[PDB]
């Protein structure tokens, strides 16, 4: 059986606090 | 723990052989070299001899040289010092003692010899 | 390792000691001359180094 | 080879004394020396191992001091138990020579 | 001054045969070691110099190891024109010392 992922995956990428700001 | 024990000493005729057999237990007999020593009444200690861990190698003391013999058995645990030519100022009460001059260094407690 | 074996020979005793500089909270700090917070002036202000 | 004696004769010192011996080398031996402590009918005690450290087990109040040639032994305190006879090895060298000794005394 | 004794006083074998011809030195002598075959009623050959090198024009079935104090001399198969008396010298001080003597 195999499932899509969908939008699931996504840990976050640092300590670092942000808000409001779209990082790569 | 680590706990050394020594038997074979008894009083013995001048130019007898005498050999004297050195316990280990408590720790890994084949991986420490062993020394061997001898304290003389009313005297400083003398170290006897050594041998290597393995055995294959050994070294003797300049007054015990050519007549003291050391030997040892991995699986025994027992390193034997064979004395040969003894003579009343060989008489000592000999030491058998594990690494020694170093933070690994243990004492056994001795057996008399007499000559 | 032996006592004969020159200098070159001779055994050393190695530590290393490994840092990671991060914005995480960084317990391990080596405080000293620590002060009061003050608030609602502009001031120099050190804050877990 | 490396010949051990100790210089100071037999000190007998009372209970909770500051006792110092001096063990010499005759040539340098570096850092190579370990100070045993035997009680009479008793195996020697390795009091500290090469110098500054202290073996384990063995009371905080000797001390090991001493580089090169000259190596020093101090107890801060006297104690019934301390009082013994003691002796230095030279390490360096493959034969190894023992201290001539120094008696403790009440 | 360095004391040098090959711990083989007289061992001698049979031809074809793997020999051992240890030497040691009182006080470490780094590498500095050099060692002659002396057959009787001739000219010391030098077999090893500087302790792991062969000397030029010798059979290379003589073998020297070791550094520092301990030194060992290995003859991978023995032949007649092997025997003869083995000799280890330290070259590290100024006063030389040649080893006892070791017959083969």
């Known amino acids: 059986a195999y499932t899509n992922s969908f939008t699931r995956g996504v840990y976050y990428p640092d300590k670092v606090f942000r808000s409001s700001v779209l990082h790569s | 723990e680590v706990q050394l024990v020594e038997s074979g000493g008894g009083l013995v005729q001048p130019g007898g052989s005498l050999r004297l057999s050195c316990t280990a237990s408590?720790?890994?007999?084949?991986?420490?070299?062993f020394h061997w020593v001898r304290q003389a009444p009313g005297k400083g200690l003398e170290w006897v001899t050594i041998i290597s861990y393995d055995g294959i190698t050994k070294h003797y003391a300049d007054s015990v040289k050519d007549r003291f013999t050391v030997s040892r058995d991995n699986s025994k645990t027992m390193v034997y010092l064979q004395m040969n030519n003894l003579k009343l100022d060989d008489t000592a009460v000999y030491y058998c003692?594990?690494?020694?001059?170093?933070?690994?260094?243990?004492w056994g407690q001795g057996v008399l010899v007499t000559v | 390792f032996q006592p004969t074996n020159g200098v070159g020979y001779q055994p050393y005793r190695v530590v290393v000691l490994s840092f990671e500089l991060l914005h995480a909270p960084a317990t391990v700090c080596g405080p000293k001359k620590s002060t009061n917070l003050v608030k609602n002036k502009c001031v120099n202000f050190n804050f877990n180094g | 080879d490396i010949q051990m004696t100790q210089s100071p004769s037999a000190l007998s010192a009372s209970v909770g004394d500051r006792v110092t011996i001096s063990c010499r080398a005759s040539?340098?031996?570096?850092?190579?020396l370990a100070w045993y402590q035997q009680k009479p009918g008793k195996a020697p005690k390795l009091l500290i191992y090469?110098?500054?450290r202290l073996q384990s087990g063995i009371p905080s109040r000797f001390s090991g001091s001493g580089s090169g040639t000259d190596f020093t032994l101090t107890i801060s305190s006297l104690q019934p138990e301390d009082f013994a006879a003691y002796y230095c090895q030279q390490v360096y060298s493959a034969p190894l020579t023992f201290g001539g000794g120094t008696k403790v005394e009440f | 001054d360095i004391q040098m004794t090959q711990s083989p006083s007289a061992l001698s074998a049979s031809v074809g045969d793997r020999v051992t011809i240890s030497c040691?030195?009182?006080?470490?002598?780094?590498?500095?070691?050099?060692?002659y075959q002396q057959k009787p009623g001739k000219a010391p050959k030098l077999?090893?110099?500087?302790?792991?090198?062969?000397?030029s024009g010798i059979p290379s079935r003589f073998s020297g190891s070791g550094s520092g104090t301990d030194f060992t001399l290995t003859i991978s198969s023995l032949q007649p024109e092997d025997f003869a008396a083995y000799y280890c010298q330290q070259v590290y001080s100024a006063p030389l010392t040649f080893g006892g003597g070791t017959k083969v």
């Open positions: 003692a594990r690494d020694l001059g170093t933070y690994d260094d243990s």
């Open positions: 040539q340098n031996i570096d850092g190579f």
């Open positions: 408590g720790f890994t007999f084949s991986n420490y070299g």
């Open positions: 090469a110098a500054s």
